[PDB]
Amino acid sequence: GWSDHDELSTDTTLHEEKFRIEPVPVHHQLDILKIAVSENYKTFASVGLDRCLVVWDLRQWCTKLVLSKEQMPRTLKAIALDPQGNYVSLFSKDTLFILNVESPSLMLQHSYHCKPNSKLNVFWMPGTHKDDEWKNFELVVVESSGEIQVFSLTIEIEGADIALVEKFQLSSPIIKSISIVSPTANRIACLTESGEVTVYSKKGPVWSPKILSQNKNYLTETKKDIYGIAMADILFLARDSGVDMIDLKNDELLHSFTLPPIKVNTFSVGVSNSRFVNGQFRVSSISFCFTHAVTEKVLYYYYGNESNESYIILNKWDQQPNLVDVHDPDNSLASLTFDELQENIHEVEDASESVMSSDGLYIFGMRRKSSSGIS
Amino acid sequence: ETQVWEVWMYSQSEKKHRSKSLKMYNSLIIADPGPSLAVSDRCVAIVLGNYVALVGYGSEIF
Amino acid sequence: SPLEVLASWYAADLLDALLMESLSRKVEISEIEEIISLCPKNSSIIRHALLAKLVLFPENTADSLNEVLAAYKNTLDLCSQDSVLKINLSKLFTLHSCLSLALQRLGYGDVSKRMYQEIFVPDSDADITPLSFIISWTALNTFAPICTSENDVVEKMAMYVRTAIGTLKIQDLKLSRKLINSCIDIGSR
Amino acid sequence: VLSPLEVLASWYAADLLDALLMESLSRKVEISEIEEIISLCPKNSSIIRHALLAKLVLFPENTADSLNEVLAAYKNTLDLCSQVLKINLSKLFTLHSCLSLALQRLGYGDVSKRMYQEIFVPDSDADITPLSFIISWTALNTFAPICTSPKENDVVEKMAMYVRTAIGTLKIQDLKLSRKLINSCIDIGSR
């Protein structure tokens, strides 16, 4: 956000000292449309209203790539990125581009099926792996039609190779769906506008859909939105009656955290300190973004205790008694039954546009109280 | 345009609120902030016209 | 006249203020006819005032279009009979759009679309009178749905308003956002 | 910015084009001759458009397909004009009436007549080229039986006094053409 000179009040706290804010001088000719991001955080990509492409490195702060509009097709319905962030994909309505950034070359171009002008949604899925020496990808292509494409895309430095594999054709138009890759296995969630929550899952060659059990007590509800943590492979599920936190694979409903009714297209979750001790996937703290349904104030409920007060036995890796002997510093921390999680209120004006941190630890955001001309 | 922007924060770990002013003289940007997306656990990027705000704390990025 | 110059000035400022109120409030012909009579016989702002009338009032386009084309058939007669034209691209695009909008409102939209398709839209600059803004805005809106069957104009014209505003928002930032969004669905076409 | 080879190509083309317009008046004309012209005209010049406007008028079934290029060249001559216009009265009138003619040949009638009735016919100066004449002749022809009906505000009278002063320069041929123009004056006075 350029200005002839930005300024902020001089800090009196180390709490604000490390707190910082910087521009990237590089820019689109015109205002932003939509963007996507690598899990590595090192990579970033962006597109404007002029639909120029730009990609940039976060830590090394050096230019990576730029593309003017006239280098590009008139239609650009969609965009997608590999989890590594080492490569880029774009969906013009008739044909997709696949380009490297770290090694700018035309890795591939390929025509693909479409049913305009139904809204797109898209998901990358890493293969048996071997980067950089050899690679593969599984291109999910979710559609408002409820069709869900999936494609093979083995790729090597020699030049990207491509072949189609399957066409899911799910019932009914869809609200939402998302990829969820457990380190053990690929899984993919699929909410319906019907409110059905199917999940395809990759048992290697097997690609099995399964009917997750939203249970009888509130089946009728229009959903707000499901959201989960794919690294946790855990399914949170919005309802005004109380969100689900359903288990995957072996699959079960667990518990429903007590909540105020919440606006649609708002729900999301974040957690501090990823780790995978003793097969368990505990985290230090959990937090909960959503706009409110009525008051429409931004809301971020917190749970967990910490810094040493608690450890989160979210789920259990095996819902069974266990006695494996390796060091468990968390055992020194107090066990958390759902009862003591105790949400921490902090209702705030909608006018302050803001987001919860991905670890959920911190709030951040801004708004313009006022602005004026050069005069 | 000159712009009296309002930075602020509220830590959950500290249960604590603070804020900062953010002047923007002669900005050509007109748009409201968003869509937003955290660029890390400690840092976030946000749309502001064609330009993108980047903010962080304790970040190695700075 | 040396006077009619100053009368043309006041009618100028009185029109630039009347066009910006046409976005927040519902405005009525009585305010325009005040500007027209306040103006002089054959001045500069007398032509722009009639354009405003042709744009801001669809219920009065046929009678209005006549008054515009008569004031232009008049400006021309007293140019040769007393002879080279002085038009810039922004005022070309201004008359261009204002006609197509006036002809969509007259049912010939079977033609008015194909005319709107070939409009050369200026770039981003400081020069942008509120007359040309109101026309470019109300023409973008009146052609945001019909034009999809080229489609470049809606997106280019919406970008002109978004990046070619120059006046304070007033239930208009939501309207400019509506322009950008309609342009987005145009991108989504 | 034109070399020295294409300037002569344009002069040669402009004389052949003028020749084809006046020849089209007392002989039967075709496009086969215009293809040779436009190709002979250098690739980005005023003579292109004059060759096109002649093709628009002289070939009426090809109106739809020759109007395409007339707009293409003008939208392209505008394209580089920024990446200020200065048009002449007779240039406006020529394009004005030539579009009116092209629209009637399409099936607009109403739209064709109203544009025709708002044509601003130039007074009577030296700006008389066989193209401007050929257009005004054929446009007077295809419109005199339509705009002559409603009576009140028309240019039919002004248009015919233009073609009067048109025919009469260096053609020096061939009496019967002048006799035909006399038949035109007879057509106007008897109207």
Q: Please list every residue in chain D followed by a chain break, i.e. its C lies more than 2.5 Å from the next written N.
A: 83
Between strands A95-100 and A108-111, the pairing is antiparallel
**CB-based burial label for A276 (10 Å; 0-12, 13-18, 19+):** exposed
The amino acid sitting at C169 is K
List of chains touching D (3+ CB pairs within 8 A): C
Q: How far apart are CA C156 and CA C137, in angstroms?
A: 12
Range B2-17 burial, b when 16+ CB lie within 10 A, else e: bbebbbbbbebeeeee
Residues of C whose CB is below 8 A from A144: none
**Distance from the C170 Cα atom to the nearest Cα atom in chain D, whole angstroms:** 33
Contacts 24+ apart (CB under 8 A), D153-159: D153/D117, D154/D117, D155/D116, D155/D117, D155/D119, D155/D121, D156/D191, D157/D188, D158/D121, D159/D97, D159/D119, D159/D121
User: How far apart, in Å, are the Cα atoms of A147 and each of A62, A173, C188, D161?
Assistant: 40, 9, 18, 70
Q: Which residues contact A95 (CB under 8 A, 6 or more apart)?
A: A73, A109, A110, A111, A112
Indicate yes or no: CB of D75 within 8 angstroms of CB of C120. Answer: yes
Put simply, whether A367 touches B (Cβ < 8 Å) is: yes
B and D touch with 3+ CB pairs <8 Å, answer no
Put simply, whether D82 touches C (Cβ < 8 Å) is: yes
Q: Which residues contact A228 (CB under 8 A, 6 or more apart)?
A: A178, A180, A189, A234, A235, A236, A237, A269
Range D38-57 burial, b when 16+ CB lie within 10 A, else e: beebbeebebbbbbbbbbbb
**Distance from the A300 Cα atom to the nearest Cα atom in chain C, whole angstroms:** 27
Nearest partner of C74 among C40, C96, C41, C36, judged by Cα: C41
Residues of B whose CB is below 8 A from A357: 38, 41-42, 44
Q: What strand order describes the sheet that includes A244-246?
A: A226-229, A234-237, A244-246
Put simply, whether A15 touches B (Cβ < 8 Å) is: yes
Residue of A nearest to B43 (CA): A357
- Which chain A residues touch C if contact means CB-CB below 8 Å? 30-31, 33, 49, 51, 75-77, 116-117, 119
Q: How far apart are CA C54 and CA C60, in angstroms?
A: 7
Q: How many CA atoms lie within 13 A of C165 on its CB side?
A: 19
CB D102 within 8 A of CB D56: yes
Resolution of the model in angstroms: 5.4
Q: How far apart are CA A234 and CA D169, in angstroms?
A: 92
- Which chain C residues touch B if contact means CB-CB below 8 Å? 165, 173, 176
User: How far apart, in Å, are the Cα atoms of C141 and each of A241, C137, D125, D140?
Assistant: 42, 6, 45, 39
The residue assigned the tokens 């930032």 is C173
Residues of C whose CB is below 8 A from A29: none
What SS3 class is residue D21?
helix
CA angle A14, A16, A19 (to 5 degrees): 110
Choose the mutation target among D67, D77, D82 for the interface with C, i.e. most C CBs under 10 Å.
Answer: D82
Q: How many helices (H) and strands (E) does chain D have?
A: 9, 0
Record the tokens describing residue C154, joined without a space: 């809606």
Record the tokens describing residue A366, joined without a space: 């801004």
Q: How many CA atoms lie within 13 A of A89 on its CB side?
A: 27
Q: How far apart are CA C134 and CA C172, in angstroms?
A: 11
List of chains touching B (3+ CB pairs within 8 A): A, C
Question: In DSSP terms, which residues pair with D109 in a beta bridge?
Answer: none
**CB-based burial label for C71 (10 Å; 0-12, 13-18, 19+):** middle
**Distance from the D43 Cα atom to the nearest Cα atom in chain C, whole angstroms:** 22
Angle between helices C173-187 and C130-143 (to 10 degrees): 50
Record the tokens describing residue D55, joined without a space: 């093709």
Residues of B whose CB is below 8 A from A306: 13
Nearest partner of A93 among A79, A80, A109, A77, judged by Cα: A77
Indicate yes or no: CB of C187 within 8 angstroms of CB of A33. Answer: yes
CB D53 within 8 A of CB D70: yes
| Cα Rg of chain D, angstroms | 17
Question: In DSSP terms, which residues pair with A291 in a beta bridge?
Answer: A298
List of chains touching C (3+ CB pairs within 8 A): A, B, D
**Distance from the A298 Cα atom to the nearest Cα atom in chain C, whole angstroms:** 21
D and C touch with 3+ CB pairs <8 Å, answer yes
φ, ψ for residue A135, nearest 5 deg: -145, 165
CB A278 within 8 A of CB A317: yes
Put simply, whether C3 touches D (Cβ < 8 Å) is: no
Of B23, B26, B32, the CB nearest to A353: B32
Record the tokens describing residue C122, joined without a space: 């200026």
First vs last C-alpha separation in chain A: 20
Residue of B nearest to C169 (CA): B30
CB A59 within 8 A of CB A39: no
Angle between helices C89-104 and C109-117 (to 10 degrees): 160
Q: Which residues contact D139 (CB under 8 A, 6 or more apart)?
A: D57, D97, D98, D100, D101, D116, D159
Record the tokens describing residue B19, joined without a space: 């804020």
**Distance from the B32 Cα atom to the nearest Cα atom in chain C, whole angstroms:** 10
**Distance from the D82 Cα atom to the nearest Cα atom in chain C, whole angstroms:** 9
Tell whether omega for the bond before A117 is within 30 degrees of 0, i.e. cis. yes
Nearest partner of A35 among B32, B41, C175, B51, judged by Cα: B51
- Structure letter (DSSP) for residue A348: B
Q: Which residues contact C186 (CB under 8 A, 6 or more apart)?
A: C144, C148, C151, C154, C155, C158
User: How far apart, in Å, are the Cα atoms of A7 and each of A1, A101, A132, A368, B19?
Assistant: 12, 34, 44, 14, 13
Indicate yes or no: CB of B27 within 8 angstroms of CB of A360. Answer: no
The residue assigned the tokens 């092209």 is D102
CB B5 within 8 A of CB B22: yes
Given CA atoms B7, A44, A227, A266 in this order, what sign does their dihedral have? Answer: positive
Record the tokens describing residue C48, joined without a space: 């722009």
Indicate yes or no: CB of A18 within 8 angstroms of CB of B58. Answer: yes
Given CA atoms A270, A273, A274, A275 in this order, what sign does their dihedral have? Answer: negative
Q: How far apart are CA C24 and CA C27, in angstroms?
A: 9
CB D159 within 8 A of CB D166: no
Q: How far apart are CA D157 and CA D13, in angstroms?
A: 33
Nearest partner of B58 among B11, B1, B6, judged by Cα: B11
Instruction: Please indicate the experimental technique that yielded this structure.
Output: cryo-EM
CB C159 within 8 A of CB A30: yes
Q: How far apart are CA C36 and CA C43, in angstroms?
A: 11
User: How far apart, in Å, are the Cα atoms of D9 and each of C172, D20, D74?
Assistant: 55, 16, 21
What SS3 class is residue C36?
helix
Other beta carbons within 10 Å of A330: 20
Choose the mutation target among B12, B32, B51 for the interface with A, i.e. most A CBs under 10 Å.
Answer: B12
First vs last C-alpha separation in chain B: 27
Residues of A whose CB is below 8 A from B7: 8, 21, 366
CB C121 within 8 A of CB C93: yes
Of A49, A116, A117, the CB nearest to C159: A49
Residues of B whose CB is below 8 A from C173: 30
Q: How far apart are CA A109 and CA D78, in angstroms?
A: 36
